[PDB]
Design goal:
12 copies of one chain form a homododecamer.
Chain A (H helix, E strand, L loop, with lengths): L2 E4 L4 E2 L5
Subcellular location (chains A, B, C, J, K, L): Cytoplasm, Cytosol; Cell membrane; Cytoplasm, Cytoskeleton; Cell projection, Axon
Organism (chains A, B, C, J, K, L): Homo sapiens
Protein name (chains A, B, C, J, K, L): Microtubule-associated protein tau
């Protein structure tokens, strides 16, 4: 349920988890 | 359920999870 | 349930967790 | 992992 | 991880 | 982590 | 100039 | 100039 | 100049 | 020699001018 | 010697001008 | 010698001008 290493103009959403 | 190494202008969504 | 290394213009949302 | 370089990204979802 | 360089990002979701 | 350099980011969600 | 949507761009010069 | 939506950009010059 | 939305930008010059 | 309407993630990098 | 309407993920990269 | 309407992820990199 974790996230790691969001870099380099990276984008993440996970709407409605 | 985890995400790793989202770089290089990368984008992920996972809507309605 | 943790997050690590959000850099490089990184953005994370996780609505409705 | 080394020397990664890229542009933007666009994604749209309608509900 | 080294020399990573990139641009922006755009993402939109309606509900 | 080294020499990482990037731009902005845009993300919008309506409900 | 109407409804334009696009991605990134990469371009390099070595001298 | 209307509904324009785009990503990033990368450009480099070495001299 | 209407509904314009965009990401970052990276641009470098070495001299 | 002017500039106008630099928006929408716009970037100008004039050098040696 | 002008430029107009650089949009839509466009990039102009003039050098040595 | 002007520039106008640099939008939509637009980037201009005039050098040596």
């Amino acid at each position: 349920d974790n996230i790691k290493h969001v870099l380099g103009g990276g984008s993440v959403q996970i709407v409605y988890k």
